[PDB]
Design a binder for this molecule. Structure first.
Ligand code: SF4
Ligand code: SF4
Ligand code: SF4
Ligand code: SF4
Ligand code: SF4
Ligand code: SF4
Ligand code: SF4
Ligand SMILES: [K+]
Ligand SMILES: [K+]
Ligand SMILES: [K+]
Lengths: 116, 116
């Protein structure tokens, strides 16, 4: 818990702990149909964990688009559903699996560490 | 809605309508492990839509069992979860997908018919 590390008046204590990765405490599916996507940016703004990334650009006559790609980083996504609800053209498919499949897909966290 | 069919004092109106099938308004997985199953009948009794069927029999020395098969009719199952909770030997695996996947797996009902 690291209380003693904080409490030690001489900073004599080191407490380490390895926590689980975020991806492993969460489960769901998410896909963005980039052809439907019109790159309004609203999902990128609203995503509270900054998992969505858009390759913005200034258009040119060779490339007359305001963006060239959009991606979701599933290492960060926690499947809150905000992006799919805000998308004006319903280009995002997103479903959280925690309640139906959480027992099987999310391993109970083992917290490791050492003291010195 | 057929109110006019009912209201017509001369029974002059025919109104038809084709409702969706029950299976298409509902989503889930369900399977029964027949080797674990002891054929106690509790799920068949509790199933509120009579979706579970047990092939009961009187035992004989050639066939010393009180039932030879058990089945779930998924055309009838609405994935309420009762059978799995009542099962004394946890022989039923059942998952309901309605809330997480209902947006994608359950098609919006569109009710057709005509008038005369
Ligand atoms: S000891 Fe292990 S536990 Fe007791 S405090 Fe220091 S850390 Fe938290
Ligand atoms: S919102 Fe729907 S549309 Fe606007 S960007 Fe994120 S995805 Fe492309
Ligand atoms: S889901 Fe909640 S989190 Fe995963 S991306 Fe769309 S928003 Fe960012
Ligand atoms: S008309 Fe079509 S709607 Fe108006 S009542 Fe007879 S049925 Fe219900
Ligand atoms: S309850 Fe568990 S056991 Fe008794 S029947 Fe339905 S399944 Fe086979
Ligand atoms: S789930 Fe609800 S419905 Fe489908 S079977 Fe077990 S009980 Fe009958
Ligand atoms: S809640 Fe969990 S269970 Fe009750 S319905 Fe929506 S999904 Fe099926
Ligand atoms: K300290
Ligand atoms: K953001
Ligand atoms: K029944």
């Amino acid at each position: 818990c690291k209380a003693c590390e904080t409490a030690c008046p001489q900073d004599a204590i080191t407490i380490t702990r390895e926590l689980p990765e975020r991806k492993d405490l969460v489960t769901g599916e998410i896909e963005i149909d980039k052809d439907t996507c019109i790159y309004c940016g609203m999902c990128e703004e609203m995503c509270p964990v900054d998992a969505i990334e858009i390759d913005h650009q200034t258009p040119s006559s060779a490339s007359p688009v305001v963006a060239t790609d959009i991606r979701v980083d599933e290492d960060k996504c926690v499947h809150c559903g905000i992006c799919k609800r805000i998308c004006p053209v319903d280009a995002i498919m997103q479903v959280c699996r925690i309640c139906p499949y959480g027992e099987y897909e999310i391993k109970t966290p083992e917290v490791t560490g050492t003291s010195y």
